[PDB]
C-alpha cells in the first residue's frame, strides 16, 4: 500500500492515499481550485474560493446582483436567436447564490432552457440551503426546488442530467411576457 500526496498538496493539502483511491479525495478536496462559475464556458479563469468574488467583480461587471432571499430575475430577450445565457447574483444569508439560465439547442429547431443556482461556497456549506425556481403565469405555475450545487462541484454535470428546472421554448412563451421571462427565485435555509 504505497501512498501518494494529493494533486493539490501544493495548495496546502496534506492527505496521502494509495494510487488507486486518489479519484475520490482528488475532486472532493477543498484545496482543488474553483473554476469560473459563469455559464460562459469561455472564460477559463481558475483560482481560490475567496478569489471568485473578486474575479466576477473584475471580469464580469455586467452581472446584476439582487436584494435578498426572494427576488425576481427578469431574463430579457429569451427568444433572441443570439441569446444563450443569463446570469445574476443573489445576496442573502451572508452568502451569494449565482443564478444561471442556459439556453441550449436540441432535436427541434427550438431550444431548451436550463435553470439552476449554485452557492459561492463549499460543498458542505451548500447542503445547508435549498432554492426554489418559479415560472408564474395566468393560472399556471412551474416550480423546481432542490439543493443548490456548490461552485466547487459546478452545474455542468447537473445540466447534463436535467437536475435543475428544465423547459423548452413553448413553455417559455407560456410564461414569457413580451420577450422577457420572469423567474421567481427563493433561497432558504435547512
Ligand atoms: Zn487533497
Ligand atoms: Zn470568469
From Swiss-Prot:
Inhibited by interaction with SNCAIP (isoform 2, but not isoform 1). May be inhibited by interaction with PEG10. Keywords: Apoptosis, Cell cycle, Cytoplasm, Developmental protein, Differentiation, Disease variant, Intellectual disability, Metal-binding, Nucleus, Phosphoprotein, Spermatogenesis, Transferase, Ubl conjugation pathway, Zinc, Zinc-finger. Signal peptide: none annotated. Pathway: Protein modification; protein ubiquitination. Changing residue 59 to A: In E; does not impair its ability to interact with CACYBP and degrade CTNNB1. This phosphorylation disrupts SIAH1 interaction with HIPK2, and subsequent proteasomal degradation of HIPK2. Changing residue 145 to A: In A; does not impair its ability to degrade PML while it abolishes its ability to interact with CACYBP and degrade CTNNB1. The keyword Cell cycle applies. GO terms for biological process: amyloid fibril formation; anatomical structure morphogenesis; apoptotic process; axon guidance; canonical Wnt signaling pathway; nervous system development; neuron apoptotic process; positive regulation of apoptotic process. It is found in: Cytoplasm; Nucleus. Changing residue 161 to A: In B; does not impair its ability to interact with CACYBP and degrade CTNNB1. It is linked to Buratti-Harel syndrome: An autosomal dominant neurodevelopmental disorder characterized by hypotonia apparent in early infancy, global developmental delay, delayed walking, language and speech delay, impaired intellectual development, and dysmorphic facial features. The RING-type zinc finger domain is essential for ubiquitin ligase activity. The SBD domain (substrate-binding domain) mediates the homodimerization and the interaction with substrate proteins. It is related to the TRAF family. This is E3 ubiquitin-protein ligase SIAH1. It comes from Homo sapiens (Human). The lineage of its organism: Eukaryota, Metazoa, Chordata, Craniata, Vertebrata.
Amino acid at each position: 500500500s504505497v501512498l501518494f500526496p494529493c494533486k493539490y498538496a501544493s495548495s496546502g493539502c496534506e492527505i496521502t492515499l494509495p494510487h488507486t483511491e486518489k479519484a475520490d479525495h482528488e475532486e472532493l478536496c477543498e484545496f482543488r481550485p474553483y473554476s469560473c462559475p459563469c455559464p460562459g464556458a469561455s472564460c477559463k479563469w481558475q483560482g481560490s474560493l475567496d478569489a471568485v468574488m473578486p474575479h466576477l467583480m473584475h471580469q464580469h461587471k455586467s452581472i446584476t446582483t439582487l436584494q435578498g432571499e426572494d427576488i425576481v430575475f427578469l431574463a430579457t430577450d429569451i427568444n433572441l436567436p443570439g441569446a444563450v445565457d443569463w446570469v445574476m447574483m443573489q445576496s442573502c444569508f451572508g452568502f451569494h447564490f449565482m443564478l444561471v439560465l442556459e439556453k441550449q439547442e436540441k432535436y427541434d429547431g427550438h431550444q431548451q432552457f436550463f435553470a439552476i443556482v449554485q452557492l459561492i461556497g463549499t460543498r458542505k456549506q451548500a447542503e445547508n440551503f435549498a432554492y426554489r425556481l418559479e415560472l408564474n403565469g395566468h393560472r399556471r405555475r412551474l416550480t423546481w426546488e432542490a439543493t443548490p450545487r456548490s461552485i466547487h462541484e459546478g452545474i455542468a454535470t447537473a445540466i447534463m442530467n436535467s437536475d435543475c428546472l428544465v423547459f423548452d421554448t413553448s413553455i417559455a412563451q407560456l410564461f414569457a411576457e413580451n420577450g422577457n421571462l420572469g423567474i421567481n427565485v427563493t433561497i432558504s435555509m435547512c
